[PDB]
Amino acid sequence: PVDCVRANELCAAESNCSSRYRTLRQCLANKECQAALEVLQESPLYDCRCKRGMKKELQCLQIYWSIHLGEFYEASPYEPVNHCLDAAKACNLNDNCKKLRSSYISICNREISPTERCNRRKCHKALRQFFDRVPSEYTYRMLFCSCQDQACAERRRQTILPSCSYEDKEKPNCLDLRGVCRTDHLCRSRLADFHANCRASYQTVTSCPADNYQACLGSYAGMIGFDMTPNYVDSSPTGIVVSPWCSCRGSGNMEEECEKFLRDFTENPCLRNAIQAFGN
Amino acid sequence: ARPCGLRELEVRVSELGLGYASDETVLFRYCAGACEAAARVYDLGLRRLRQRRRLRRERVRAQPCCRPTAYEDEVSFLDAHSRYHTVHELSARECACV
Amino acid sequence: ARPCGLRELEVRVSELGLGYASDETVLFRYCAGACEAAARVYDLGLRRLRQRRRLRRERVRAQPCCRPTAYEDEVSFLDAHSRYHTVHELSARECACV
Amino acid sequence: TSVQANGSFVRATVHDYRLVLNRNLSISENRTMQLAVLVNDSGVLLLHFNVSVLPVSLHLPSTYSLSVSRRARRFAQIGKVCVENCQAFSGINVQYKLHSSGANCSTLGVVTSAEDTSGILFVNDTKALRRPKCAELHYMVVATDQQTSRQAQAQLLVTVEGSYVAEEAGCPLSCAVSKRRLECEECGGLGSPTGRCEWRQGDGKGITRNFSTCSPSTKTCPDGHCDVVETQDINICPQDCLRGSIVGGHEPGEPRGIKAGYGTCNCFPEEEKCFCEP
Amino acid sequence: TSGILFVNDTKALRRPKCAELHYMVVATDQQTSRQAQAQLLVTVEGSYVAEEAGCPLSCAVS
Amino acid sequence: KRRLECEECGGLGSPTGRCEWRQGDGKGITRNFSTCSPSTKTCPDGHCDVVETQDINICPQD
Ligand SMILES: *[C@@H]1O[C@H](CO)[C@@H](O)[C@H](O)[C@H]1NC(C)=O
Ligand SMILES: *[C@@H]1O[C@H](CO)[C@@H](O)[C@H](O)[C@H]1NC(C)=O
Ligand SMILES: *[C@@H]1O[C@H](CO)[C@@H](O)[C@H](O)[C@H]1NC(C)=O
Ligand SMILES: *[C@@H]1O[C@H](CO)[C@@H](O)[C@H](O)[C@H]1NC(C)=O
Numbered sequence: 018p019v020d021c022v023r024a025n026e027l028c029a030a031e032s033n034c035s036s037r038y039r040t041l042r043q044c045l046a047n048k049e050c051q052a053a054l055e056v057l058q059e060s061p062l063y064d065c066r067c068k069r070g071m072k073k074e075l076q077c078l079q080i081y082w083s084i085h086l087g088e089f090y091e092a093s094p095y096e097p098v099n100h101c102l103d104a105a106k107a108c109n110l111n112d113n114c115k116k117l118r119s120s121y122i123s124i125c126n127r128e129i130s131p132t133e134r135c136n137r138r139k140c141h142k143a144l145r146q147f148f149d150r151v152p153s154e155y156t157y158r159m160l161f162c163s164c165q166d167q168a169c170a171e172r173r174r175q176t177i178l179p180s181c182s183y184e185d186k187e188k189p190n191c192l193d194l195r196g197v198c199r200t201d202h203l204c205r206s207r208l209a210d211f212h213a214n215c216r217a218s219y220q221t222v223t224s225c226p227a228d229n230y231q232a233c234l235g236s237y238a239g240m241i242g243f244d245m246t247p248n249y250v251d252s253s254p255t256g257i258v259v260s261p262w263c264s265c266r267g268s269g270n271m272e273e274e275c276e277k278f279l280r281d282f283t284e285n286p287c288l289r290n291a292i293q294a295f296g297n
Numbered sequence: 298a299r300p301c302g303l304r305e306l307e308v309r310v311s312e313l314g315l316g317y318a319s320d321e322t323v324l325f326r327y328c329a330g331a332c333e334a335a336a337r338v339y340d341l342g343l344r345r346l347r348q349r350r351r352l353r354r355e356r357v358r359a360q361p362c363c364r365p366t367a368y369e370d371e372v373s374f375l376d377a378h379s380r381y382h383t384v385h386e387l388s389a390r391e392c393a394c395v
Numbered sequence: 396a397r398p399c400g401l402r403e404l405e406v407r408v409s410e411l412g413l414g415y416a417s418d419e420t421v422l423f424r425y426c427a428g429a430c431e432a433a434a435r436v437y438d439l440g441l442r443r444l445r446q447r448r449r450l451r452r453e454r455v456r457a458q459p460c461c462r463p464t465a466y467e468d469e470v471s472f473l474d475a476h477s478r479y480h481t482v483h484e485l486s487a488r489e490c491a492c493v
Numbered sequence: 494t495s496v497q498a499n500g501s502f503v504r505a506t507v508h509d510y511r512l513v514l515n516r517n518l519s520i521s522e523n524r525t526m527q528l529a530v531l532v533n534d535s536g537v538l539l540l541h542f543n544v545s546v547l548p549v550s551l552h553l554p555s556t557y558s559l560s561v562s563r564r565a566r567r568f569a570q571i572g573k574v575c576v577e578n579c580q581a582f583s584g585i586n587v588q589y590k591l592h593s594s595g596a597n598c599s600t601l602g603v604v605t606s607a608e609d610t611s612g613i614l615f616v617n618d619t620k621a622l623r624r625p626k627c628a629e630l631h632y633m634v635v636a637t638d639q640q641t642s643r644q645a646q647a648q649l650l651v652t653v654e655g656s657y658v659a660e661e662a663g664c665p666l667s668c669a670v671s672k673r674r675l676e677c678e679e680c681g682g683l684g685s686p687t688g689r690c691e692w693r694q695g696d697g698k699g700i701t702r703n704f705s706t707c708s709p710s711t712k713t714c715p716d717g718h719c720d721v722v723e724t725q726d727i728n729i730c731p732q733d734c735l736r737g738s739i740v741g742g743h744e745p746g747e748p749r750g751i752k753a754g755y756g757t758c759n760c761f762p763e764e765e766k767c768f769c770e771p
Numbered sequence: 772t773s774g775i776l777f778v779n780d781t782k783a784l785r786r787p788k789c790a791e792l793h794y795m796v797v798a799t800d801q802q803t804s805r806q807a808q809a810q811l812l813v814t815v816e817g818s819y820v821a822e823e824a825g826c827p828l829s830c831a832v833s
Numbered sequence: 834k835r836r837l838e839c840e841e842c843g844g845l846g847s848p849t850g851r852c853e854w855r856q857g858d859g860k861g862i863t864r865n866f867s868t869c870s871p872s873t874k875t876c877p878d879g880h881c882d883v884v885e886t887q888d889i890n891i892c893p894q895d
């Protein structure tokens with residue numbers, strides 16, 4: 018398994034491979050394209066992955082999407098691997114979780130104007146830095162904690178602090194938000210990571226591919242801190258339905274694909290069964 | 298006779314007396330002990346001048362009290378009414394006998 | 396009461412009571428005054444936990460005592476036996492409430 | 494939107510056409526127009542708009558008869574100068590100035606808040622008010638403008654009324670230094686026109702906006718707003734205008750200030766520090 | 772026809788940052804504009820001790 | 834520091850198992866300073882021999 022950084026390392030160590038890589042990069046960014054394709058289908062850049070929380074993930078993804086030829090699903094460039102009161106108490110007794118926790122809270126709970134509720138990009142940056150370098154027995158315990166009443170569900174909803182990040186003035190079109198997320202490098206890669214690990218299945222007994230709860234939970238929590246950042250819909254104790262901040266309105270004749278894209282978050286038996294079995 | 302250093306204790310938020318209506322528990326680091334062999338020539342001379350009343354009869358301190366050096370930065374929590382709070386400089390990180 | 400800072404004095408060598416036999420006069424500086432604008436959230440939490448007796452019954456400090464930050468280097472003098480003597484750290488150089 | 498056809502629910506588009514300005518219109522516009530709008534649904538639709546831009550009169554009531562006590566201190570609010578339509582201006586800057594008649598008894602000043610576009614009297618000098626010579630003062634309040642130089646003017650009569658009593662020996666310079674109730678009213682700070690500081694008393698309901706404190710004016714200092722008068726020199730109202738640190742369970746204001754506190758809250762503006770404790 | 776140094780501010784002398792100050796003393800003229808200039812190095816030296824509680828503002832009050 | 838706690842406890846360097854107390858004079862800064870030593874012939878001797886310099890807990894006052 019060769020990641021794209023070392024694939025560029027072996028690419029820059031050779032003359033023909035670098036020539037065909039820069040040739041295809043000048044093609045994308047007939048006959049010049051097809052020869053570069055039939056050469057670089059044997060490159061170490063061909064089928065290179067990236068890692069979660071690796072150093073210079075952005076360059077790895079910019080290299081990986083550079084060789085990609087120009088669509089509901091895409092290939093993931095990654096390695097295919099009171100209760101909530103007690104979760105917060107287990108965080109605040111460690112030192113690494115406490116510092117970054119107070120970091121994203123003291124950033125995201127700063128009202129600026131009576132119009133601007135909070136700063137968006139710094140709050141997303143703090144949430145990404147929280148959900149990258151914290152051990153996952155702390156994140157999953159605070160974000161997924163089994164509740165029986167309304168106050169526990171409200172604490173669990175308020176954990177990613179949706180008053181700044183999740184909600185907006187309007188609910189835009191889900192397809193437009195998908196286009197915005199697929200414009201950016203990082204959000205498109207996290208969305209493909211979520212699509213590769215959290216589809217429904219008719220063959221496996223838990224409707225999840227490879228019967229892997231862990232990959233679908235990591236593909237869920239890796240979408241926090243982007244524009245396609247989901248959260249719960251209400252403070253329901255047992256009813257657990259996640260959703261991004263959009264809706265099916267404004268769809269036109271593209272209504273069915275919008276509904277099918279939204280049913281990945283609203284009506285996934287794989288993700289809901291994974292959350293329920295993790296709560297058990 | 299124990300050396301002055303960090304002492305840790307798990308405490309409620311509402312037992313800290315800061316009026317935050319919350320029941321979470323955080324760890325608390327405070328400086329505790331007794332400074333005995335830290336007296337200097339400054340300390341002895343100032344004590345003797347208090348014994349001779351050359352002083353201008355003010356508030357002075359002629360025993361080295363053990364205090365924190367640098368505090369922890371931030372502790373954030375949520376209340377009983379779904380609203381976060383960020384307390385700056387709650388516990389100590391280093392204890393020095395000055 | 397007055398705020399804490401430097402106060403000067405001029406005292407004899409043998410009036411320090413250290414056993415020296417001389418009559419020269421040295422310029423003794425000291426930190427004096429009151430700390431009322433230096434209590435922090437740490438101080439309030441420590442005071443409240445002393446009130447609820449959750450403490451392990453040790454010696455703590457919930458009033459920030461004003462001590463010198465640094466100290467002066469040397470004091471050189473001569474005595475009744477005609478012998479030079481240099482003493483380190485006799486007075487202060489900067490005051491702060493800690 | 495969802496409309497019914499035969500007991501069903503289908504959806505359709507409701508387009509909204511609104512009409513938006515492009516710049517700050519000045520006062521001197523006295524026009525009217527009709528605007529025509531083409532709509533192409535590529536079916537060809539026409540819309541109209543009767544717009545009427547009417548100018549604004551800027552006259553004021555002519556004489557603002559008012560008084561001031563002799564015990565007052567520097568930077569204390571007295572009265573409000575404003576246009577007849579105070580809360581009508583949005584994008585027109587209106588500034589207020591003074592012209593003393595004798596040019597020897599300069600005591601008062603006017604600064605303009607651009608929220609209400611209105612001016613507030615403030616005591617600038619103590620000695621000129623302290624003199625028994627300059628006891629009834631006549632000012633020409635001139636209401637000016639920035640964009641188009643239409644202006645107006647008016648009369649200001651003010652009477653220097655009362656007696657003078659010295660303050661106490663150990664008084665500080667601001668009202669908020671006191672902590673109990675008695676030492677607040679038995680000493681005079683800076684911003685009050687009464688010469689003494691006022692005490693408002695809160696509640697025991699935890700971290701509230703109703704925090705017990707000592708202010709110059711109970712209608713001005715714990716108002717939740719830092720106006721133009723308080724922001725001149727930071728000793729007047731520290732509990733609405735500071736940029737500093739707070740010791741105690743609280744919540745700070747949105748640009749600045751104390752939004753909510755617990756217990757009694759005093760402030761040292763010389764160190765930009767505040768304390769809240771029962 | 773000579774100039775005398777005077778302390779204008781206390782706080783800037785009180786700061787430990789502005790401890791060695793370099794000024795361009797410019798000797799000017801009124802009638803004919805021939806002028807010159809020179810260097811001024813000054814060192815902020817010593818310690819600071821607060822005064823007493825009941826002090827007046829002038830020396831001659833005592 | 835006092836006399837009783839010196840002899841009612843045993844330190845390191847003494848072959849007697851208890852510490853010895855020598856008592857000085859009130860003549861100011863003297864060589865005859867009252868102290869608690871392991872041996873009154875070895876520790877306040879004015880000389881740091883080979884035995885005391887092995888581990889520095891034996892005779893700190895030499
Ligand atoms: C605006 O123009 C009309 C035109 O007849 C005039 O009557 C009116 O007085 C003008 N407005 C003002 C404020 O003078
Ligand atoms: C509306 O747009 C279409 C598309 O260009 C154009 O052919 C048509 O002429 C337009 N309608 C009018 C009234 O110009
Ligand atoms: C707008 O102006 C035209 C001009 O005559 C007039 O016919 C029409 O009635 C006006 N609109 C309304 C709503 O009065
Ligand atoms: C319009 O008026 C407001 C009023 O304060 C001012 O802040 C703004 O800069 C003005 N803008 C233009 C384009 O004149």
Ligand SMILES: *[C@@H]1O[C@H](CO)[C@@H](O)[C@H](O)[C@H]1NC(C)=O
Pocket residue numbers: 602603617
């Ligand atoms: C207040 O008085 C000072 C000094 O006399 C002066 O500089 C200032 O301009 C006055 N304030 C106003 C608003 O004119």
Ligand SMILES: [Ca+2]
Pocket residue numbers: 713714715716717718719720723730733
């Ligand atoms: Ca105010």
Ligand SMILES: [Ca+2]
Pocket residue numbers: 875876877878879880881882885892895
């Ligand atoms: Ca020896």
